[PDB]
Amino acid sequence: QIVLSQSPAILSASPGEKVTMTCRATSSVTYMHWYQQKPGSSPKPWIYATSNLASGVPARFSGSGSGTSYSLTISRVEAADAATYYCQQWTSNPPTFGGGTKLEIKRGSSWTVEDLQKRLLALDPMMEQEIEEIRQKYQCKRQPILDAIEAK
Amino acid sequence: MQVTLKESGPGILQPSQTLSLTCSFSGFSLSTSGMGVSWIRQPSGKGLEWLAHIYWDDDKRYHPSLKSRLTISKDTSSNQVFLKITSVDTADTATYYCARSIYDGYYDYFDVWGAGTTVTVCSGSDYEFLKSWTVEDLQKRLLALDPMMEQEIEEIRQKYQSKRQPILDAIEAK
């Protein structure tokens, strides 16, 4: 019913460069919520009640908005931040999510070793997700033959 | 102390079948007013699509687009919440999370998320042809899938090694 619109759909930034992303809605929205999700894992509550940071969210993040103008602002982008951010509302049924902004690093393909290590780890959950979907492809592929055998 | 959620899925289904999901949780009860748990699903490489919800007072909410298919259930003593989806097709292949929302009347948001479960809708052709084959002929094709599967998996491994290599070379350099 209320449709959340996220722009930009994809955002490419440089480490240390302030950015801002927006979510706009058909109708007036009492509160805007934000969720971060790195590929392969569950989403994390990032910003709630339009401008409140969840436990463990870096101070470099910020939320702002009123009416149907809602925006997230990263003060100083860092490599760990690269993820898809979704906006969500519950002003009325049904609750709805935005398209999400995928945050990417300009230079993704010589920082501090901590940063390089962080990006190095982010890779593992994607690969597991991909591998698993290959297992269910063959779990699906396998099932017809089993049933035919299981007949008698 | 804190809240966890765990979703129990079936892995794979064929079309038209009733997909059923379990979500077990700890750290809160659905005997506490304001407590509620909703189902959200995410297609691979696509966005979040909220599904259903349920409250302490047994009050349900549904995606209007799919409500006829959906049904949401709860087990207050057992701390379980069930989502049943009927007559499934390819559009149901997704990763199904399970989340909590506290209803105060003001902000209603999802404060804790389970790990999620991944379901695949077997794109299902007529497979009556097999029933012509005997056991041993069927065993052959069954045996063929395992080497074929592990080759697509090592391909995903090699693909991510080539992604690791620029960062790895960045580490050893300095």
Numbering used by the authors:
A (entry chain B): 1 to 30, 32 to 110, 117 to 159
B (entry chain A): 0 to 31, 31A, 31B, 32 to 82, 82A, 82B, 82C, 83 to 100, ...
Task: Provide the publication's sentences verbatim.
Integrins are one of the most important classes of receptors that mediate adhesion of cells to extracellular matrix (ECM) components, which is the hallmark of multicellular organisms. Integrins exist as a heterodimeric molecule comprising two type I transmembrane subunits α and β, yielding various α/β combinations with distinct ligand specificity. Laminins are heterotrimeric molecules consisting of α, β, and γ chains and are major component of basement membranes. Recognition of laminin by integrin receptors is central to the epithelial cell adhesion to basement membrane, but the structural background of this molecular interaction remained elusive.
HUTS-4 is a conformation-reporting antibody against β1 that preferentially binds to ligand-occupied β1 integrins. In order to maximize the stability of the complex as well as its conformational homogeneity, we utilized two antibodies in the Fv-clasp format; the affinity-enhancing TS2/16 and the conformation-stabilizing HUTS-4. The latter was included because it is known to bind inside the β1 hybrid domain in the open conformation and expected to prevent closure by acting like a wedge. Consistent with previous epitope mapping result, HUTS-4 recognized species-specific residues E371 and K417 located at the inner face of the lower region of the β1 hybrid domain, explaining why it cannot bind to closed β1 integrin with tucked hybrid domain. Unexpectedly, HUTS-4 also lightly touches the PSI domain, which may have contributed to the resolution of this domain in the cryo-EM map by fixing the PSI-hybrid inter-domain angle. As the first step toward the reliable atomic model building, we fitted the crystal structures of each unit contained in the complex individually to the map. Models of the N-terminal half of the coiled-coil domain of tLM511 and a long helix located at the bottom of HUTS-4 Fv-clasp were omitted from the model due to the low quality of the corresponding cryo-EM map.
